[PDB]
């Protein structure tokens, strides 16, 4: 599974502001999710944003909306998976889904399962995906891996999409990754 | 393997009183196993409970018993695996087994092996499964995933079973997960 | 792969005296390797022991020799893999090899590759296998896992062989695991 | 996948001067990469070196060039993968690639994928591979192994190539591994 700007879509899973206080490393996950949003906008990659029950949970964080392409749709849902009817038009035109968003073990995991069933490759951006619980997040990644999803990072994805430093949009995406993505406790303390 | 209340069974492995002093995170595992017992009762999911040598090892912890459906069967065994004659008819009806309890590397692991041989999918609830030794538990999970068992968490499992906030039993199961399941030392301390 | 006393052999890899100063958790690995030596003797499981360059690295630690049955051969070698001509006949009569010993990333790993090629299932006893370096040991397990070897522990293996407390040899092998196996730093320290 | 000096090539990717201050464990990785370069020269294993945009990033670190086998090609590139036309003839002669170098999640990962696509076995030397970010490096290895790359270590590789202590070049390669390769924090802390 080799991602490029013409065979991939970005899915933004339920990144709503009323979650903030519960989600682990939420500020970092917003920062890094915005990088992927910008990258998708620069690389003309179709972006889908969902919102879980926005009547109670509010809408997508403003900063993320501000990076979205002019015609990016935002679909509301009560089903955990992002694979709802109005997303299928986008899904027919791509072979890869890049996934960011929250409750890795719920909406991100169920989405991942649905996309894999449909024969799509799923690229989970671990530094842009989190849960209320560290354990739920930790094992969400394992379940996604077991099922065949690629566990990747923001900088790996962004540079993987352009393939080389000669890419027409390399300088634009390089600006987004000038500083390393903020740490989200993914790397264990080292044994001496 | 997509779990729902109609294609799954809950298996409760040997969570007995005399194990309290020896099993790592025993109190936590009891709390979290009870959540899964409750979810199964709510969603009409058949529950099987076993006990190993109940005369020596005690009976199932009261907190767990108190959550069981009116006619949930409790079977005693000497075999490590829960796949014993009295459980065979339950297994014939289901495609998935949700697994909690102890002897992670013994009874839980051997149960897992036996179920996979029978063609069942196994969903090991890591935050509800433990051992006397941290090392035994850690590599039990690795052995299960190697064998093809799914390493999942209680909250992932509960919400996975309902699939969305419009499920008629969503509000009932939502009570079970109001607070995150207690930590059982599954996530490594991270470095900067 | 389901291990039992009639389908398995124990392979003891190069647990020699001069490694004592240059192996992480050497005393712990000897203690635990002796447990598997004991279990194999009790259960009539054929045991094969090797020695690499005994003139320059010393002989098998006395504790381990004392646990071997009256027969049990000790083969010297210069090749890293324990798969030398004298071991070929034992391998033909079994489907599983339980593996303990040192140079996880060298002698243990190469033995593992050779055995899997011969069509044998390999069960690596992680709490009885080590290296001079933590990194070499850590990724040795990952390499073994990748090739299809099972990463197991001493108690999991010993109890896995008997399958229940009604087994005629249960109480005899239970003696070997009354106390948990020594801790060889294999579990990540966890975040609060 | 059984590496020997006659079926293998060493790929050194983008270990250049301007990366020195922007790569975790750069000095360690250079020391360890030099061990593999020396081993390849000793064992007459074909070595290939790439440099990414050497106009801006400078050239291969002097110490590494000092050890290179006599007729070693060094190719420049802007594409992240080492799999460029000039490397094709080398790759048609081998079944195994040993990989060291930097942007674990960029050059090394992209090279790894390209190599695996060509039906080559990839041996990733984890103690000679790193990134600017720990998280990027950590998941680089995960993505590599998901794709089928072997995560190995320098000492495992050197000794794996010779097969035994009676190899005509064993004493020569043994000098390179007299001390353990410098630690790069790859093993999870288990005890403070």
Coordinates of C-alpha atoms in Angstrom, one line a residue, chain B:
Chain B
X1 CA -14.7 -10.4 13.2
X2 CA -17.5 -7.9 14.1
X3 CA -19.0 -8.5 17.5
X4 CA -22.7 -7.9 18.1
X5 CA -25.1 -9.2 20.8
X6 CA -26.5 -11.9 18.5
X7 CA -23.2 -13.6 17.3
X8 CA -21.2 -13.5 20.6
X9 CA -20.8 -15.1 24.0
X10 CA -19.1 -13.9 27.1
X11 CA -16.7 -16.3 28.9
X12 CA -15.7 -15.6 32.5
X13 CA -12.5 -17.6 33.4
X14 CA -12.0 -18.7 37.0
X15 CA -12.2 -15.4 38.8
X16 CA -12.3 -16.9 42.2
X17 CA -11.7 -15.6 45.8
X18 CA -8.5 -17.4 46.8
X19 CA -6.7 -15.8 43.7
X20 CA -7.2 -12.3 45.2
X21 CA -3.8 -12.2 46.9
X22 CA -1.8 -13.6 44.0
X23 CA -3.1 -12.0 40.8
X24 CA -1.7 -8.7 39.6
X25 CA -4.4 -5.9 39.6
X26 CA -7.0 -8.4 40.9
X27 CA -9.4 -5.6 42.2
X28 CA -9.2 -3.7 38.9
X29 CA -9.8 -6.9 36.9
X30 CA -12.9 -7.7 39.0
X31 CA -14.4 -4.2 38.5
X32 CA -13.8 -4.4 34.7
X33 CA -15.0 -8.0 34.4
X34 CA -18.2 -6.9 36.2
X35 CA -18.7 -4.2 33.5
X36 CA -18.6 -6.9 30.8
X37 CA -20.9 -9.1 32.9
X38 CA -23.4 -6.2 33.0
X39 CA -23.1 -5.4 29.3
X40 CA -23.8 -9.1 28.5
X41 CA -26.8 -9.1 30.8
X42 CA -28.1 -5.8 29.3
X43 CA -27.6 -7.0 25.7
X44 CA -28.9 -10.5 26.2
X45 CA -25.5 -12.0 25.5
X46 CA -25.1 -15.6 26.8
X47 CA -22.6 -15.8 29.6
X48 CA -20.6 -18.9 30.7
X49 CA -18.7 -18.8 34.0
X50 CA -16.2 -21.5 35.0
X51 CA -14.4 -22.2 38.3
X52 CA -11.3 -24.3 38.7
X53 CA -11.2 -26.5 41.9
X54 CA -13.8 -24.3 43.8
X55 CA -13.3 -26.2 47.0
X56 CA -9.6 -25.1 47.1
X57 CA -9.7 -21.9 45.1
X58 CA -13.0 -20.6 46.3
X59 CA -16.2 -19.6 44.4
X60 CA -16.6 -16.8 41.8
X61 CA -16.1 -13.4 43.5
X62 CA -19.5 -12.1 44.8
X63 CA -19.3 -8.8 42.9
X64 CA -19.3 -10.8 39.6
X65 CA -22.0 -13.2 40.7
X66 CA -24.2 -10.3 41.6
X67 CA -24.2 -9.1 37.9
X68 CA -25.1 -12.5 36.3
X69 CA -28.4 -13.1 34.5
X70 CA -30.9 -15.1 36.4
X71 CA -29.9 -18.5 34.8
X72 CA -26.2 -17.9 33.9
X73 CA -24.6 -21.4 34.4
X74 CA -21.5 -21.9 36.6
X75 CA -19.4 -24.9 35.7
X76 CA -16.5 -26.4 37.7
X77 CA -13.5 -27.8 35.9
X78 CA -10.0 -29.2 36.4
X79 CA -9.1 -28.8 32.7
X80 CA -7.4 -25.4 32.1
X81 CA -9.5 -24.6 29.0
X82 CA -13.1 -23.5 29.4
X83 CA -14.0 -25.6 26.4
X84 CA -15.6 -28.4 28.4
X85 CA -18.6 -30.6 27.5
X86 CA -21.2 -28.2 29.3
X87 CA -20.0 -25.2 27.1
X88 CA -20.1 -26.9 23.7
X89 CA -23.8 -26.1 22.9
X90 CA -23.3 -22.4 23.6
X91 CA -20.3 -22.3 21.3
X92 CA -22.2 -24.0 18.5
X93 CA -24.5 -21.0 18.4
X94 CA -21.9 -18.2 18.4
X95 CA -19.1 -17.0 16.1
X96 CA -17.3 -14.8 18.7
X97 CA -16.2 -15.2 22.3
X98 CA -15.4 -12.3 24.6
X99 CA -13.0 -13.5 27.2
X100 CA -12.3 -12.2 30.7
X101 CA -10.5 -13.7 33.7
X102 CA -7.4 -15.4 35.0
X103 CA -4.7 -17.8 34.2
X104 CA -4.0 -15.3 31.3
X105 CA -1.1 -17.6 30.2
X106 CA -2.9 -20.8 31.4
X107 CA -6.7 -21.1 31.5
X108 CA -7.4 -18.0 29.4
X109 CA -4.6 -18.9 26.9
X110 CA -5.6 -22.6 26.6
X111 CA -9.3 -21.5 26.3
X112 CA -8.2 -19.1 23.5
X113 CA -6.3 -21.8 21.6
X114 CA -9.2 -24.3 21.8
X115 CA -11.8 -21.7 20.6
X116 CA -9.6 -20.7 17.6
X117 CA -9.3 -24.4 16.7
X118 CA -13.1 -24.6 16.7
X119 CA -13.2 -21.7 14.2
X120 CA -14.3 -19.1 16.8
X121 CA -13.1 -15.5 16.9
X122 CA -11.7 -14.6 20.3
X123 CA -11.7 -11.1 21.8
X124 CA -9.4 -11.0 24.8
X125 CA -10.3 -8.1 27.2
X126 CA -6.8 -7.2 28.3
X127 CA -8.0 -4.8 31.1
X128 CA -10.1 -7.7 32.5
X129 CA -7.4 -10.4 32.2
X130 CA -4.3 -11.0 34.3
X131 CA -1.8 -13.3 35.9
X132 CA 0.2 -13.8 39.2
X133 CA 3.3 -12.6 37.2
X134 CA 3.4 -9.5 35.0
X135 CA 5.7 -11.3 32.6
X136 CA 3.3 -14.3 32.2
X137 CA 0.4 -11.9 31.5
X138 CA 2.5 -9.8 29.0
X139 CA 3.6 -12.7 26.9
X140 CA 0.1 -14.4 27.2
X141 CA -1.3 -11.4 25.2
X142 CA 1.6 -11.8 22.6
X143 CA 0.8 -15.6 22.3
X144 CA -2.9 -14.9 21.8
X145 CA -2.3 -12.3 19.1
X146 CA 0.2 -14.6 17.4
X147 CA -2.6 -17.3 17.4
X148 CA -5.1 -14.8 15.9
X149 CA -7.0 -13.7 19.0
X150 CA -8.0 -10.0 19.1
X151 CA -6.5 -8.0 21.9
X152 CA -9.2 -5.5 22.9
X153 CA -10.3 -3.4 25.9
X154 CA -13.6 -3.3 27.9
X155 CA -14.7 0.1 26.5
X156 CA -13.8 -0.9 22.9
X157 CA -15.9 -4.1 23.4
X158 CA -18.9 -2.5 25.1
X159 CA -19.3 0.3 22.5
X160 CA -18.3 -2.0 19.7
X161 CA -21.3 -4.2 20.7
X162 CA -23.8 -1.3 20.3
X163 CA -22.1 0.4 17.3
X164 CA -23.7 3.8 17.8
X165 CA -25.4 6.1 20.2
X166 CA -28.9 5.3 18.7
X167 CA -28.7 1.7 19.9
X168 CA -31.8 1.1 22.1
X169 CA -29.5 -0.2 24.9
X170 CA -26.9 2.6 24.4
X171 CA -27.9 4.7 27.4
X172 CA -27.9 1.5 29.6
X173 CA -24.3 0.5 28.5
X174 CA -23.1 4.1 28.7
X175 CA -23.6 4.0 32.5
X176 CA -21.1 1.2 32.7
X177 CA -18.3 3.3 31.1
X178 CA -19.0 6.7 32.6
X179 CA -15.6 6.4 34.2
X180 CA -12.6 4.9 32.4
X181 CA -11.8 1.3 33.4
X182 CA -9.1 1.3 36.1
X183 CA -5.4 1.1 35.1
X184 CA -3.8 -2.3 35.0
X185 CA -0.3 -1.2 34.1
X186 CA -0.6 -2.0 30.4
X187 CA 0.9 1.2 29.0
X188 CA 4.6 1.8 29.3
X189 CA 6.0 5.0 31.0
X190 CA 7.0 7.2 28.1
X191 CA 10.2 9.2 27.5
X192 CA 10.6 12.8 26.1

